[PDB]
C-alpha cells in the first residue's frame, strides 16, 4: 500500500532532498509531484533517489537500509535528530550531530545501561562506542583508539569528555573506590584534567564559544585486569598568538577573563591586576559574558586543587597569566632623532619584572639594546620600536606557551602513575577542527592540514586497509575505488623535497637573508601555481595570497608574518634573564633555552618542521591501534538548537566519506573470525560435522560451513580466517545461545523424567516386609522424602516450565519440539507421581492397622499358651506320696474339684480357635496349629497323671 504512493526523493535547493510522488517515467525524463506543495515537476530520471519504506524510520544503523543514497541518509539523520536522537551508526563507525542544548542522555543510569552490552542490544551512543573499544582491548589485548572527526564546533571535545566519563566510571579498580558511591583520587583527577586544559587552552572563536586552540591525544593506561592505572596527555600546537591578539567578536584564553572578573580585592592587589579595558593584549575589551566569571574562576581553582597543585603553584600560574598580559602594557616609543626604541614610561616594566622575578635595568637593556655574540666578543645593538615591540609579543607568547607546557607536565605527574599498564591503552584523539575565518593564517593552515591527515586516516582504514586484508587472505575480490584519497593536498603541504611543499618552501624562504612574506608568496605562486590543489589569487577578487583545496573546502590564506611565526624568534638576552629568574615558576618554565638567538639552510628546526615531526609520531602511534571513528557533524552555523541545515549536513557527510564507508561495509565482509575461534564457538550448531581428530583449521571450518548450509555469498574462506557479511555472526551467536538453552533443557528434563519414573516404581511395589518396624520404616522414609527430595524436584518442574516458555518466545525461527518432554506432559507425569504418593501412604495406613491387629492376636495367643504350659507343668507336684490314713480320702476329694480343669480347656480351645479364626481372615503363620495340638497331646498326658495319681492314691484302706 505504501509502495502504491510511488514516493521518491528529488533534489531540493532549500531542503536538500524532498519527497515526491513519481507521476510517470521515461528513459531520460521523469515527472513527479511534490508531496509538500503538490507541485508538478519534470526532471531527468538520474536525479531521482529511491526512498525507504516507513519500517526504516529512525533506523539505528544506516548500513541496514534497503536503499542507500544521500537523500535517505540525510532523512534518517534528520528524523532521528528532531526526536532528540543525536547518535546514529553507519556500518563500523558512528555519526553524531551537535544538538546545541542540554539533553538528559548522559546520566549515571544511562552509563550502567551500556555496561557489557553489544552495539545492537542498545540504542546508538558514545557509551556503546566506548564500551566496544574497551571490550575489544580486553579481549584481543590490543591497544585501541577513539577518533573524533569534525569541523569547528561539531562536538569532538564534548564527545571526548563523555568517553572519559564512561571509562572512569566503569573501569576504576577496587582501589580508588575503597568505599562504594565515592569516586577515588584517580577518578576525580582524571575528570578534572580537561576543564583545567580548557581554562588555559580554550577560547571563544566565531565558530565555537569553547574552541580548543590546541590538539590533544590522551592515553588511558589499564592493568592486565582491565582497570585504569594512569593516563598520559600529549598536546599539540597551542595557538600561542591568541595571547597577544584576537579578531572581531573573538576572545583570548578563558583563564584571562576568569582571573580579571573573578579575583578578590587582595588577589587583584598581590598579582597587580588591572581592569580589562587597560590591557592591550585583550583586543575586544570586557568579557562577552560577565559576572559568571567569579563562578568559573572558583571552579578552575577547585579543579586545580583536585589535581596535585599547591597554593604556591596556583598563585604562581595566575601571576604568570598577569605577566603575559603586563608585557602588552609597556609603551615603547622611538627617539626624537633616531628609530631607537625608548621606554618613556617604565611603570609597566616595573610590574612585569616583579611578576617575572627579574631586574628592571637588566630587562630594559636586554629588550631595548640586546647584546649579540660574534667572533669571541659581545656587541650591543640598538632595536627599533617595531623590532622591540615584536620581541615583547614573542616573549609574552613564548611565556604563555611554556606555562601551558608546564601545566601538561604537571597533570601528567598527577595523572600518570603506575607503569604496569597491562600491555594496553585507550587513546582518545581530540584535535582542533577544520576552520575557515575572514583571515586564515599559519595557524589555520596547520589545523586544516591535521584535519586533512585524520580524514585520510579514515580513508586508509576504511578503504585501503580493508581491501588489502582481502588480497592478503586470497579472497575473490576486485578493488573498489571510492574516490577518497587526499594525497594531492597532503603532499602539496607536507612534502619535504623533490618538489618541496608549502611548509618546506616556507622553511627555505625564512632562512634566506633578504626574504620577506611577499617573496615567499611569489616563490609559492611560481613553484606551486600548477598544482591541482593550489590556487593563485585572481586579479580584482582574492585579497588573499593563495588558496588550498582542502577536503572540507577551499581556504584562502594571508601569509602575514609567516616567516616569523615559522622561525619563532626570541630575544636571547631576555630569555637568559628569565632563565636566571628569582621566581621559582618563571625559572622552571624558562629552564630549557635552545631557540633562535638574534642572528646551507641551518641547524634549527622551524615550527612547521617540528609540527610535521610531531604529527608523524601521532600517526605511527595510531597505526598500532584498532581505531573507532566518531564523525561529529555541526547542524548549522548559528549555534542554534533544533535547526538542522540540510546543505551544511550534506557537505560534511560528503567530505567525510560517510556514504562510501557505509557502502564498503555492505559490499565487503566487515567481520572476520579465526578458524580455531569459529570451530570452538559454533560446534554446538554442527554436532556431527567434524569427525574424531581432524587436526586442521581451514577444513574443519569448511565442514562446519557445509553442515550449516550457509549461503555462499554470506562468507569467504581465507588463508587464516573466515570473512562474513554484516550481521552473520550476530545471528550465529543467537542460534548458538538457542542451542545451548535447548541442550541444557533437554539434559535436565531427561534426568527429571528418569527420577520421577524410578520413584513411581518405588511407590507401587506393594511389599512392605511383614514387620511393624518395617511398616514404620516405610512411613519414616516417605515423610522425609516428601520434605527433602521432593521440593527440589518440584522446583525443577517449575524452573524447566519457565525456561521452555522463555526459549519459545526467544525464537524470533523454528520452535523446539521434543518428545515426551513437553512441560505440559512433565505436569501429567508428576500428577501421576503424586497420585502414586497418596495411594502409597494410604496403603501404609491400612498396612499399619493390619500389622498391629496381628501383633495383638499374637500376644493374646502366646500369653494363653504360656499360662497353659505353666499350669500343666506346675501340675508336676503330683509326685509326692508320703502319707498316713485320713490323708488319701482328703486328697481324693481335692482331686475331684481338679476335674473342673476342662472348664479351662473349653475356654482356651475356644479362645485359640477365635484368635486363629481372626488371623486367617488377614494373614497366616499357621505353624501354630501344630504347636497347640502338641500341647493338647501334652495335656492328655497329664490327663493320664490324673488317673496316675487317682489309682496311685488308691490304697487298700479299710481292712
Ligand atoms: Mg573543542
Author numbering: 49 to 647, 663 to 875, 880 to 1026
How does the study describe this entry?
Nonmuscle myosin-2C, the gene product of MYH14, is one of the slowest myosins-2 as its steady-state ATPase activity lacks potent F-actin activation. Transient kinetic signatures of the nonmuscle myosin-2C enzymatic cycle include a high affinity for ADP, small kinetic (k-AD/k-D) and thermodynamic (KAD/KD) coupling ratios, and a higher duty ratio than it is commonly found in myosins-2. Together, these signatures qualify nonmuscle myosin-2C as a dynamic strain-sensing actin tether. The overall topology of NM2C shares the structural four-domain architecture of myosin-2 motor domains comprising the N-terminal subdomain (Nter), the upper 50 kDa subdomain (U50 kDa), the lower 50 kDa subdomain (L50 kDa), and the converter that terminates in the lever.
We determined a 2.25 Å pre-powerstroke state structure of human NM2C, one of the slowest myosins-2 characterized. Crystallization in the presence of the ATP analog ADP⋅VO4 was achieved after truncation of the flexible N-terminal 45 residues extension and the fusion of the NM2C C-terminus to Dictyostelium α-actinin tandem repeats 1 and 2. NM2C pre-powerstroke state characteristics include a closed conformation of the nucleotide-binding motifs switch-1 and −2 in the active site. In this conformation, the characteristic salt bridge between switch-1 R261 and switch-2 E483 that is pivotal for the hydrolysis of ATP is formed. The coordination of the co-crystallized ADP⋅VO4 is similar to other myosin-2 structures in the pre-powerstroke state. The relay helix is in a kinked conformation, the central seven-stranded β-sheet is untwisted, and the converter domain and the adjacent lever arm in the up-position. A slight reduction in the JK-loop length in NM2C causes an 8.8 Å shift between switch-1 and the U50 kDa and abolishes the formation of a tight interaction network with residues of the active site found in other class-2 myosins. Strikingly, NM2C lacks all interactions described for scallop striated muscle myosin-2 due to the replacement of R128 with Q150 and JK-loop shortening. Residue R788 at the interface of converter, Nter, and lever is highly conserved in nonmuscle and smooth muscle myosins-2 and the only connecting hub between structural elements of the L50 kDa and the Nter in NM2C. In NM2C, R788 forms three main chain and five side chain interactions with residues of the SH1-SH2 helix, the converter, and the lever in the pre-powerstroke state in addition to a side chain interaction with a water molecule (2.8 Å).
